[PDB]
Amino acid sequence: AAGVTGTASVVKMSYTDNNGKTIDGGLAVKVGDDYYSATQNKDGSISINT
Amino acid sequence: LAEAAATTTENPLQKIDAALAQVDTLRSDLGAVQNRFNSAITNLGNTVNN
Amino acid sequence: ANRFTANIKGLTQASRNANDGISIAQTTEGALNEINNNLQRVRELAVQSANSTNSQSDLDSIQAEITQRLNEIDRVSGQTQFNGVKVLAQDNTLTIQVGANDGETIDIDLKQINSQTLGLDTLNVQQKYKVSDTAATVTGYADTTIAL
Amino acid sequence: ANRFTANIKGLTQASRNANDGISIAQTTEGALNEINNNLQRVRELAVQS
């Protein structure tokens, strides 16, 4: 509906800093090279943040 | 409620430091908002006098 | 004598008008003072950020305070008003009538001041973080209104 | 003048509201401080383990 032309998947995010240390992020919906952030319902079903 | 630990917890120190990072991030936010309030109050005083 | 009285009334009211002018000048100056203090603090932070020992979390904190200061600047810019006239929201000219005749007037110029007209909206000290992702395969179920 | 009076009263009340905000911020930060101390102790013990 938002007109994003691609396939979608659900992923869990991890970040790194220039020193090589790591931290964890939330859930995001991946569309090829582009990411969107997501939340999970009480049932494991997924929604994208808006 | 705290679920019962079934096994020994690996990489504990990473997790503890992640928690420390959470805490300090929140403290930073609160300090910043305090400073904003100080500025707002100063402005209100001057405005009222004028 | 009647002419004299007319001029006397006019000049008295003109004195009142000028008083009004001083008041609005004072109000606007007062606002600008706090904006100035905010900018001082932001420069302090900018100086602090350039030190190469800062870890990226520290840059995040510094950017947090910078952003809040800028938001406060915009708040003062948008909200400040005097007798309904929003002094600092827009560029505009005011004219005060200080004599008894046409054009015996004084002008006050005013400017829109905020993060945008100061060219500081893009102020950011954050270094790029590195981004990776992993496949969170959620097996699960939920019901939909469509009937059986 | 009446309009000015309204503005003055409102701004005074707003000042007091801002004070309330500062107070709640301080309270939260203090609790966070105690929590930080506890976490430090836990990290120390984890190292010792």
* Residue pointed to by tokens 């009937």: C147
Resolution for the entry shown, Å: 2.9
**Six-digit token pair at D46?**
């984890």
In the PDB record, what is the listed experimental method? cryo-EM
CB neighbourhood size of B40 (10 A): 20
Which residue of B17, B24, B27 is the best one to mutate when testing the D interface, meaning the one whose CB has the most D CBs within 10 A?
A: B27
Helix (H, G, I), strand (E, B) or coil at A48: strand
Query: Mind telling me how many Å the CA of C72 is from chain D's nearest CA?
Result: 13
The closest alpha carbon to C43, from C130, C136, C123, belongs to: C123
The closest alpha carbon to B25, from A9, C103, C62, A32, belongs to: C62
Burial class of residue C86 in the structure, from the number of CB atoms within 10 Å of its CB (0-12 exposed, 13-18 middle, 19+ buried): middle
Residues of chain D in contact with residue C84, where contact means CB-CB under 8 angstroms, are 3
Nearest residue in D to C20, CA atom: D1
Q: Do residues A23 and A15 make contact, with C-beta atoms less than 8 angstroms apart?
A: yes
* Residue pointed to by tokens 């905020």: C114
Q: Which residues of D touch B (CB under 8 A)?
A: 8, 11-12, 14-15, 18-19, 21-22, 25-26, 28-29, 32-33, 35-36, 39-40, 42-43, 46-47, 49
Alpha-carbon radius of gyration of chain B? 21
A11 touching chain C per CB within 8 A? yes
- The torsion defined by the Cα of B24, B30, B31 and B33, in degrees rounded to 10, comes to 150
Burial class of residue D19 in the structure, from the number of CB atoms within 10 Å of its CB (0-12 exposed, 13-18 middle, 19+ buried): exposed
**Six-digit token pair at B6?**
């079934």
CB neighbourhood size of C87 (10 A): 22
Name A22's bridge partners: A16
Going through A1-50 in order, the beta strands assigned E by DSSP cover 9-16, 22-31, 34-40, 46-48
* Residue pointed to by tokens 């004072």: C26
Query: Mind telling me how many Å the CA of B5 is from chain C's nearest CA?
Result: 24
Query: Mind telling me how many Å the CA of C26 is from chain B's nearest CA?
Result: 7
Alpha-carbon radius of gyration of chain C? 28
Which residue of A18, A23, A24 is the best one to mutate when testing the C interface, meaning the one whose CB has the most C CBs within 10 A?
A: A18
